[PDB]
Design an enzyme around this catalytic site. Structure first.
Site, short mmCIF file in Angstrom:
data_model
loop_
_atom_site.label_atom_id
_atom_site.label_comp_id
_atom_site.label_asym_id
_atom_site.label_seq_id
_atom_site.Cartn_x
_atom_site.Cartn_y
_atom_site.Cartn_z
CB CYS B 43 -0.94 -0.04 1.47
SG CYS B 43 -1.53 1.22 1.29
CG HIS B 44 -0.53 5.19 -0.65
ND1 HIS B 44 -1.94 5.20 -0.18
CD2 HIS B 44 -0.90 6.28 0.82
CE1 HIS B 44 -2.38 5.52 0.29
NE2 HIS B 44 -1.51 6.45 1.27
CB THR B 45 0.21 3.26 4.36
OG1 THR B 45 -0.87 4.99 3.71
CG2 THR B 45 0.30 4.25 4.94
CG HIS B 65 -1.05 -1.00 6.29
ND1 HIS B 65 0.14 -0.77 5.68
CD2 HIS B 65 -2.44 -0.57 6.02
CE1 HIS B 65 -0.81 -0.04 4.48
NE2 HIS B 65 -2.14 0.13 4.71
CD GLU B 66 -4.64 -3.06 1.42
OE1 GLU B 66 -4.12 -3.70 0.46
OE2 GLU B 66 -4.89 -1.56 1.35
CB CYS B 95 -11.15 -0.40 22.61
SG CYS B 95 -12.00 1.41 22.94
CB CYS B 98 -12.56 4.72 24.00
SG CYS B 98 -13.24 5.06 21.91
CB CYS B 101 -15.17 2.06 20.65
SG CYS B 101 -14.21 1.89 19.99
CB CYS B 109 -11.03 3.01 19.23
SG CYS B 109 -10.44 2.41 20.67
NE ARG B 113 -7.84 8.10 18.77
CZ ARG B 113 -8.99 9.75 19.06
NH1 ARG B 113 -8.05 10.70 19.20
NH2 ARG B 113 -9.96 9.22 19.69
CB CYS B 173 -5.69 -0.06 4.69
SG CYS B 173 -4.51 1.45 3.85
NE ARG B 368 -3.31 -2.03 -1.74
CZ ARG B 368 -3.29 -0.85 -1.51
NH1 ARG B 368 -2.98 -0.15 -3.24
NH2 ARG B 368 -3.96 0.39 -0.79
#
Ligand SMILES: NC(=O)c1ccc[n+]([C@@H]2O[C@H](COP(=O)([O-])OP(=O)(O)OC[C@H]3O[C@@H](n4cnc5c(N)ncnc54)[C@H](O)[C@@H]3O)[C@@H](O)[C@H]2O)c1
Ligand SMILES: [Zn+2]
Ligand SMILES: [Zn+2]
Ligand SMILES: [Zn+2]
Ligand SMILES: [Zn+2]
Lengths: 375, 375
Positions: B43-45, B65-66, B95, B98, B101, B109, B113, B173, B368
């Site tokens: 991912c670009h992130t 993260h994917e 969570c 909180c 949420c 969250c 977050r 994501c 992707r």
């Protein structure tokens, strides 16, 4: 119908006292109705263009858009009004046949939406007012500072004829705008908190509205601390003077409110206040509403993460009420004791003393001052 | 549960090729889960933090993260998950206890977050990863560029076990972020028109949502004209490259659409695009949505009447989806043939050719690229 000779409060020159003149008021043309103004009040927007503070200045001019009056005659094509009807002119209209009129969401009629530069009527581009053969220009298509005025029938709300026009005239701008800013646009949930920057007649309608929505906290925010005491009568629970605090006023609010308010409503017309009004809402669900009309071009700014923190921001005009459709209904709401109007009215002057109304608003002494024709 | 040794592609230094290493994965502690990763994409992130473009360089690090994988074990206190469940790790959690949420409005969250600086687990600040007893840092609490990772359960969406993990990993994501931006925040009505700025994975999700949402005109905006052809598959009916126009891009869209789009979605994070995205929408009912995350600190700027003419500006995060509650649902949409995800996957490489994914994405060749563990 022929031409009427009547009194009007004329502005010949920017930021100067109004003059009662004998003017001639042309008859209504297609889709226009001619109205006898019985009662009118002053709204800050009048003052802003009267001072030629911001806009393209246009003079001479007849201001006024908050008024109560009586249809004297109607133009060709008019079926929803007749002579004798009790009516409220509104600065923005409702044609019933545009996308915006047709929309559930919008009141920005493509035909009849607010236009502050336009000094003449739609129909022919000419003014209906003159003195010695010279045009005296219109305002917001209402120009209520005259004993008689001509208004497009689409901007004229027929109301219950038993309504006292000298109370319900405020329903035609300021009051509904604040009210609607809250009930139709921000839409605070029961128990929620709301912040209102500005406590003039508009701000206090909004407050009245949030109370109406069952908001548990209504935070009044204003630079004029003397507006504070009366504010609780309209549902305000605490007041804050930004000058009394070192902290950024939005930081002051965020801390008061375990993170910021649920809704905020912007009623003064200062961009930093708008910036401040947006930044003071809670992340995730905060919604800020701008309603004060700005004079600067200053940008709304801020780190976008306030938004990505799922905070919405909506802008509104005239409380998003549809003028011909809703407003007659709101007036009924006062007969029905939902709305307490007498309290918005702090001063009264005769038409002959209209200049006292500019003095009062400019001294921060009044909420609304009613001007009475025929005196 | 004890310690696991597996393959991981470790980043020792910014902008440099990832290297496949044998690492140790400690067991999950309270409220944590250990997941066997089956498929991941880039991912670009990932590239940005991998390049040490901006923040604080943190290395060594395990990006990713994917992903889609299977619960291997859960730490003490985990009840909503058990060994064998198919899950998607999400870069941000829910969570459930909180303030955010609990709200209907927000998916941010207070606890869970997104955090790009954190290299260790919440519980104890320590990393579950090591090489010869030295820490390899987490990335977004997922670190899926590993055969096994430890993830706080608040960041794990238990999903349909029938879902092909090699398809639905992209939903965690980029894709959902766009999608939700439309369907959850913009909420285009059937028949309405939409402008989308940025045609990356996010934009194409947003475009896809508008199609799903029944937009009749979906206008794509990107500086790389080479993304235009592939966008039609995603529901875009036309694309516009500002470089091909002298006129401001918002002014152009407004004439094309007789006043501006009904909805807009800003997907680049460029502030200049945020201003345009907001200003190109229709007054009265227009809604602009910012979702692109800015890399710079420039302020959003705009003339206030743009709001008072009744435009609305909303920002959202992760498409306003709640990580544990909603993401399973978006997955159902793919199952139920509502969501067509396959068109997003332009490459597949084995875990061993993970450095190719960087290349493909860096040449703008990919939407992707899916990575397959065990090869
Ligand atoms: N959107 C509409 O349809 C509509 C309708 C009516 C009025 N308005 C506009 O709304 C605004 C309010 O109208 P009003 O008649 O109630 O005005 P008002 O003068 O009676 O009240 C303005 C209040 O805001 C306060 N204020 C001024 N600057 C401030 C600042 N920086 N920070 C905080 N408070 C500040 C002032 O103390 C004042 O009390 C005007 O801007 C008006 O032009 C809009
Ligand atoms: Zn007004
Ligand atoms: Zn209309
Ligand atoms: Zn991503
Ligand atoms: Zn939470």
């Amino acid at each position: 119908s022929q031409i009427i000779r009547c009194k009007a409060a004329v502005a010949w020159e920017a930021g100067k006292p109004l003059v009662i003149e004998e003017v001639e008021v042309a008859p209504p043309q297609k889709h226009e109705v001619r109205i006898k103004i019985l009662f009118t009040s002053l709204c800050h927007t009048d003052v802003y263009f009267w001072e030629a503070k911001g806009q393209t200045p246009l003079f001479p001019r007849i201001f006024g858009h908050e008024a109560g009056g009586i249809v004297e005659s109607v133009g060709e094509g008019v079926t929803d009004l007749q002579p004798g009807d009790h009516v409220l002119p509104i600065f923005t209209g409702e044609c019933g046949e545009c996308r915006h009129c047709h929309s559930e969401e919008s009141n920005m009629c493509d035909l009849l939406r607010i236009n502050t530069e336009r000094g003449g009527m739609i129909h022919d581009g000419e003014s209906r007012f003159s003195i010695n053969g010279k045009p005296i220009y219109h305002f917001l298509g209402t120009s209520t500072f005259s004993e008689y005025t001509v208004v497009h029938s689409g901007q004229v709300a027929k109301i219950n004829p038993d309504a006292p026009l000298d109370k319900v005239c405020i329903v035609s701008c300021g009051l509904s705008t604040g009210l609607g800013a809250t009930l139709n646009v921000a839409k605070p949930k029961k128990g929620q908190s709301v912040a209102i920057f500005g406590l003039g007649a508009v701000g206090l309608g909004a407050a009245e509205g949030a109370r109406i929505a069952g908001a548990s906290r209504i935070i009044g925010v204003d630079f004029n601390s003397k507006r504070f005491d009366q504010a609780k009568e309209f549902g305000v629970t605490e007041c804050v003077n930004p000058k009394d605090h070192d902290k950024p006023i939005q930081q002051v609010i965020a801390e008061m409110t375990d993170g910021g308010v649920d809704r905020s409503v912007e009623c003064t017309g200062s961009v930093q206040a708008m910036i401040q009004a947006f930044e003071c809402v809670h992340d995730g669900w905060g919604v800020a509403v701008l309603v004060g009309v700005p004079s600067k071009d200053d940008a709304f700014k801020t780190h976008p993460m306030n938004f990505l923190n799922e905070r919405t921001l909506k802008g509104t005009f005239f409380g998003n009420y549809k003028p011909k459709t809703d407003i007659p209904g709101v007036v009924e709401k006062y007969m029905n004791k939902e709305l307490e109007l007498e309290k918005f009215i702090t001063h009264t002057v005769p038409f002959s003393e209209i200049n006292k109304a500019f003095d009062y608003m400019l001294k921060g002494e009044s909420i609304r001052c009613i001007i009475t024709m025929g005196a």
